[PDB]
Amino acid sequence: GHRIPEETIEAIRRGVDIVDVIGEYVQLKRQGRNYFGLCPFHGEKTPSFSVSPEKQIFHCFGCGAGGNAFTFLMDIEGIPFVEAAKRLAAKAGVDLSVYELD
Amino acid sequence: GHRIPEETIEAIRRGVDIVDVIGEYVQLKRQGRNYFGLCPFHGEKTPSFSVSPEKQIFHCFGCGAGGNAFTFLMDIEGIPFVEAAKRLAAKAGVDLSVYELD
Ligand SMILES: [Zn+2]
Numbered sequence A, B: 001g002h003r004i005p006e007e008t009i010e011a012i013r014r015g016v017d018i019v020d021v022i023g024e025y026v027q028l029k030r031q032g033r034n035y036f037g038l039c040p041f042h043g044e045k046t047p048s049f050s051v052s053p054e055k056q057i058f059h060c061f062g063c064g065a066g067g068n069a070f071t072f073l074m075d076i077e078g079i080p081f082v083e084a085a086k087r088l089a090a091k092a093g094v095d096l097s098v099y100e101l102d
């Protein structure tokens, strides 16, 4: 479980687009149905980072990093799950004030 | 937060005690300033669930569930926030019929 109800965590995830989220940190270019760019987690000159709008997940073929929007924001900023859930909740339009976290 | 005014949500939270709310689902026993019992969210033989009267929150270290009375009710019964708020408002003495929810 978490300090945010399961159902609400679900609504947050469904309310955001991982491409929009990652695009605030990584310059992405469309290639087919996915978006690609340089991995911000590992160092290498060649693009190896991929994001899938359809699966709502990212993957890096150079370091193995990957996952959904929570995993990307907890690792890009070094912030805990409830802090990443707060920032995704604002993009999703989900209220989190009633759960007395912050 | 939704459809219930912020001041009304604070009257609900003041009007309920999470020890009393969780004690309707979990057998609790006081140990100094907290209440402890078996987790109803995850399966374990030993007690790992705690409730703080002062902070009005709960926590289970064997599964991570936790938070306030809203989180507890929504996750224990699998109900949305409006239903959880109507149940806690009935215990708090707060009338919500004038806000036109459901
Ligand atoms: Zn990488």
Ligand SMILES: [Zn+2]
Pocket (backbone or CB within 6 Å): B039, B040, B041, B042, B043, B048, B049, B060, B061, B062, B063, B064, B065
């Ligand atoms: Zn548990």
